[PDB]
């Protein structure tokens, strides 16, 4: 059922967990570094888990897709063919920016965070800077122990702050990916849908130095030896069975002004969905003629596709449950309740008004702010602007450098510049620049930016073409030039004739001022948000509703049972899919083109000791009433005894709108069954060595 419960809320859910069927004690679960919770790791944007004492980690195919893509070429396309390292020495690097974060400690710092904020006084900008200064000092102190990375999280609008400390593994290697026609069976056609038939898994291996301390890639590194790992279920999962997930959901907005919801539904989602689809079509067309563009842009295309379909799903869901209407009515009820407490309600009423005025301020420049940011996120302009900003920040003492541009961020920046090599073709990027320039020119006068207008020198197709021709002379297209600029000083940027660099230098003062404006609005938010949000929680509580913070990338628990759902009268979705369902969707064409070994094994009813007699087949995916969001891809799904029965990977179509308004009747997790992982690795793309290492071969 509903709720992305923080670990500190365990006492409050212990009863509900037991009732739903958990057989471990709640104390066993409350040990976040013990068995089984210490097996669960964060990847940054996805979850994963250790499944062997020798550092083997399982996650979803879509979470590992970037890594697989970085190791693929047009001639040797791992996304298509899969990957299997017969011995640990055959494992390839997942890339310099790949990470496994292993939880070490959590500390409440609410009181100190709030003191630092109050010491700033009445000034909004100083308030943001106080918090940033507080965070940076706290993080620096925490990260004094080498090999750790720390993160400060704000919960419930800034009513609570917790510091997480994680062991930061920096040498992550790809151990196994099934072929893409299994790992992403059904592609974008089945994405966000049930029935689903997707083998959404892949394996990494975590490495550390010989001293046991995290290190970057090196052939002298050895497998990390985790304190805890998960074991596969020995009992068959069935309909009605208890399941729970631990993971790192990224963002929800169930606590939101109606006007925030309205802006998102009517502008933000449709705008982004449209831009993503326009860019998908260009890259798709270009890749049909050029297999290098096809492979190098595959990971980018996967996100554009996933995000734009998610946004379409939300808009449809909003219309299905009248979300606008629910947001309006709820807000009116809360404002009513506040007015009826007289004096005591006044500060939440005032905060509401302040939040609403801040939303209007950001609304006034939204077309500009979005268009500029996505224009600047094409490969060469993004590189130029990032690197030129780093050169500005390096002249300051580290403690005053913008977050993202401190010494602790240098590894990531550097890695990003190398990874780009496998994600950039000039002729493709030029079409993307052109798209963004064309969109820029359609902006009205009051949303334009002098520096870009000037650089463009014109307002028509001929000007667009002349800027593109100028930008094409950049040298930032090679990895070696990008790294040269990574180490260079500000004066060297300001002297360059590289036209991408020249653009960056010209627009930088504008980006910095827009940034200050955003930090200023953010400081007024720091004052107003906690007060309104605490009032929303208090009201939810007086209505007897579940109270838990919106997602924010930290560790949460959700629990429930295996069950289907009913999308319309006269029909139901069943909780499982089966092998025979996979073959029934076969067409021989991407994305419905299973490996011939899969088709042969199913026709021959080779079930591999994994059949669930109750469904007559090996199960493939299943549905459950857990409450997950982006970031939970890859999370282990545990049964009553804390054994692995699956991985979380998707939601059904009707579920995605629960990001704003939760609907219990059609919100389900889609997970891939542990037995289908094992089946694929026995009968279709064999990895006997991995099955042995996890004691199931």
């Amino acid at each position: 059922g509903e709720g992305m419960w923080v670990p500190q809320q365990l006492p409050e859910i212990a009863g509900p967990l037991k009732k739903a069927g958990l057989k471990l004690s709640p104390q066993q679960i409350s040990d976040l570094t013990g068995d089984p919770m210490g097996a669960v790791v964060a990847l940054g944007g996805c979850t994963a888990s250790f499944v062997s004492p020798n550092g083997l980690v399982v996650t979803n195919h879509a979470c590992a897709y970037g890594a697989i893509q970085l190791n693929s070429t047009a001639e040797n396309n791992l996304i298509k063919n899969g990957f299997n390292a017969p011995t640990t020495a055959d494992e390839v690097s997942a890339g310099p920016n790949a990470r496994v974060f292993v939880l070490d400690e959590i500390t409440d710092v609410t009181k100190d965070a709030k003191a630092a904020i109050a010491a700033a006084g009445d000034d909004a900008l100083a308030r943001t800077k106080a918090l940033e200064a507080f965070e940076k000092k706290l993080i620096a102190d925490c990260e004094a122990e080498a090999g750790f990375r720390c993160r400060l999280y704000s919960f419930s609008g800034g009513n609570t702050y917790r510091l997480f400390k994680n062991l930061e593994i920096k040498d992550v290697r790809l151990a196994y990916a099934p072929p893409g026609s299994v790992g992403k069976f059904g592609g974008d056609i089945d994405n966000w849908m049930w029935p689903r038939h997707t083998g959404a898994f892949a394996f990494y291996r975590a490495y550390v130095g010989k001293d046991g301390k995290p290190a970057a890639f090196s052939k002298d590194n050895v497998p990390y030896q985790p304190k805890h790992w998960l074991k596969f279920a020995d009992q068959p999962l069935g309909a009605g069975d208890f399941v729970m997930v631990a993971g790192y959901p990224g963002s929800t907005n169930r606590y939101a002004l109606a006007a925030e919801f309205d802006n998102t539904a009517q502008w933000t989602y449709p705008t982004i969905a449209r831009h993503y689809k326009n860019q998908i079509a260009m890259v798709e067309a270009a890749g049909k003629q050029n297999a290098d563009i096809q492979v190098k842009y595959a990971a980018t295309m996967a996100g554009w596709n996933n995000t734009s379909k998610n946004y379409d799903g939300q808009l449809e869901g909003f219309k299905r449950i009248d979300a606008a209407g629910q947001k309006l009515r709820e807000e009116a009820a809360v404002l009513g309740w506040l007015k009826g407490q007289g004096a005591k309600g006044q500060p939440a009423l005032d905060a509401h008004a302040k939040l609403l005025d801040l939303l209007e301020q950001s609304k006034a420049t939204r077309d500009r702010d979005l268009t500029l940011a996505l224009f600047n996120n094409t490969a060469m302009l993004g590189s130029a602007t990032q690197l030129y900003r780093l050169s500005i920040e390096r002249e300051k003492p580290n403690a005053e450098r913008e977050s993202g541009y401190q010494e602790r961020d240098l590894p990531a920046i550097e890695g990003g510049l190398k990874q780009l090599e496998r994600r950039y073709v000039a002729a493709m990027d030029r079409q993307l620049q052109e798209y963004w320039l064309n969109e820029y020119i359609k902006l009205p006068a009051d949303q334009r930016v002098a520096a870009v207008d000037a650089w463009l020198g014109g307002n028509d197709a001929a000007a667009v073409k002349r800027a593109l021709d100028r930008l094409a002379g950049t040298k930032l297209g090679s990895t070696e030039e990008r790294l040269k600029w990574f180490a260079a000083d500000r004066k060297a940027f300001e002297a360059s004739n590289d036209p991408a660099i020249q653009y960056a230098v010209a627009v930088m003062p504008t980006l910095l001022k827009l940034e200050q404006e955003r930090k200023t609005r953010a400081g007024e938010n720091l004052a107003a948000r906690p007060v309104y949000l605490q009032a929303l929680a208090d009201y939810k509580k007086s209505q007897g509703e579940f109270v838990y913070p919106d997602a924010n990338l930290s560790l949460r628990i959700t629990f429930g049972n295996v069950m289907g759902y009913a999308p319309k009268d006269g029909m139901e979705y069943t909780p499982f899919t089966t092998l025979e369902g996979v073959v029934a969707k076969e067409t021989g064409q991407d994305p419905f083109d299973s490996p011939k070994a899969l088709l042969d094994a199913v026709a021959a009813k080779r079930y591999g000791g994994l059949e669930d007699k109750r469904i007559g087949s090996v199960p493939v995916n299943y549905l459950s009433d857990l409450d997950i969001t982006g970031g939970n891809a890859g999370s282990p799904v545990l049964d009553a005894h804390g054994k692995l029965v699956g991985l979380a990977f998707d939601g059904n179509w009707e579920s995605v709108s629960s990001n704003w308004v939760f609907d219990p009747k059609m919100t389900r997790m889609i997970a891939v069954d542990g037995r289908y992982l094992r089946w694929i690795m026995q009968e279709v793309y064999p990895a006997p060595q991995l099955l042995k290492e996890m004691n199931v071969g």
Binding site: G250, S251, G630
Partner: peptide
């Protein structure tokens, strides 16, 4: 696919 969006 429930990967983190941005």
């Amino acid at each position: 696919d429930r990967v983190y969006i941005h």
